[PDB]
UniProtKB/Swiss-Prot annotation, chain A:
Changing residue 195 to A: Decreased secretion of proteins; no effect on growth. Residues 113-203 form the PpiC domain. Belongs to the PrsA family. Pfam families: Rotamase_3. It is a lipid-anchor. The gene is prsA. One of its GO terms (molecular function) is peptidyl-prolyl cis-trans isomerase activity. Changing residue 159 to A: No effect on secretion of proteins and on growth. The lineage of its organism: Bacteria, Bacillati, Bacillota, Bacilli, Bacillales. All three domains (PPIase domain and the flanking N- and C-terminal domains) are essential for activity. This is Foldase protein PrsA.
Length: 257, 256
């Protein structure tokens, strides 16, 4: 049969398709069956267009530059699209099925205490920083310049660092300087271990009820980057579907979760 | 054949062929690599059922109760098979890993300020005081470790190998431990794991006196590094003729 197809020839004996299939199944059968079934069920429920696919694909090339071409050559252009489509589907499933309570929001608000949000631009030389300082004053936007100049991972994100307190969660040279700032204010070059920083304090923390709706959006984005929370959501969709595994070895793949 | 239905769904079925295809993209290279290696190595090296059982027993103990779960999911035969594969990769790596003098001097430089110690761990302090009293009669520490110790180190005579002051087992343990001299054995140390009797076996001496002894230690270190093992295994693979006929998996052995 087709299982007799020789995958690899060796002087110590051949590896057949059947051998490959059997051992793959003990190893990866459950996880791949899971993905296959979920992308089928979700693709029928939620709808994802190539418009949507390319957008999250773009975010992936930037985050993963140069190494990208190796994956594109190794796996293929279509297979990557498929993986992206799967993520977008599981994301859509999670948005419809995840619910953040007000306990979660007030819980997020408290924990934002004594915290501030800020962006930064990381560079090597003090003259490079003054180059950027001048481009700012001329009117260029901070987010744009961070993408052009910043060495840090936040460079794609327009330099955003999210929330952080003064105590820890950062270098004391940076955070002291950041916390010294006023809201909306941009700093002068700040020398640190990593280099020179231009910091922009984005917002102070204050009040709940005023701040409620933005924090809800933040809580949700946070639950969307926890894959356990996503799969917890996706699995609800999978139960409501009638999945029947006919292969005994992989039964119970979806039965309980 | 490949049109066999693995899973039925309201959104369409998953076939064997589809499943075969999508596993191949994720896990094909890695599983093909093991299949080829277990064929080639089994042709060269031979593993006895006793060696397999010995490692099988060690895994039962290390994973108490968690073993019988894996035994249920996979089966005894598959487990022995994986154990046989491990033993094969070990034998090949033993023969092919080469420890350089740079490997050893870097290892020696890493023992700077470290100590070697054995311990006997027990649950209750009444048990600890029984062992202390037997020691003074002249009984061997390693023997008493084998008899009383609850820790996995009981088989090595209680040996914990080298460690720094940064509490690797426990900060209460390492503090009590560094307080000792070579040959000195301590009294019971209460911790989360139980009561410990610690005996410091070594200080870091000269490189020349330690050189030959350290070589075996370095090798044992590289045997617990899978990168070092697979690199050595691949030296054995060099002497064999692997020809992958599958288009998608052509570059599986063509390492950079």
């Amino acid at each position: 049969s087709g299982d007799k197809e020789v995958i690899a020839k060796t002087d110590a004996g051949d590896v057949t398709k059947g051998e490959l299939y059997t051992n793959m199944k003990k190893t990866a059968g459950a996880s791949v069956l899971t993905q296959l079934v979920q992308e089928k069920v979700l693709d029928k429920k939620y709808k994802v267009s190539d418009k949507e696919i390319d957008n999250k694909l773009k975010e992936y090339k930037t985050q993963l530059g140069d190494q990208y071409t190796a994956l594109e050559k190794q796996y293929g252009k279509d297979y990557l699209k498929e993986q992206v489509k799967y993520e977008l589907l599981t994301q859509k499933a999670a948005k419809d099925n995840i619910k953040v309570t007000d306990a979660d929001i007030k819980e997020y608000w408290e924990g934002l205490k004594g915290k501030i949000r800020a962006s930064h631009i990381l560079v090597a030389d003090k003259k490079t920083a003054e180059e950027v300082e001048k481009k700012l004053k001329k009117g260029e936007k901070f987010e744009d310049l961070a993408k052009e100049y910043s060495t840090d991972s936040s460079a794609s994100k327009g330099g955003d660092l999210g929330w952080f307190a003064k105590e820890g969660q950062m270098d004391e040279t940076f955070s002291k300087a950041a916390f010294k700032l006023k809201t909306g204010e941009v700093s002068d070059p700040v020398k640190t271990q990593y280099g020179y920083h231009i910091i922009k304090k984005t917002e102070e923390r204050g009040k709940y009820d005023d701040m409620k709706k933005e924090l809800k959006s933040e809580v949700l984005e946070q639950k969307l980057n926890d894959n356990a929370a996503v799969q917890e959501a996706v699995q609800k969709v999978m139960k409501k579907a009638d999945i029947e595994v006919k292969d005994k070895d992989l039964k119970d793949t979806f039965n309980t979760s």
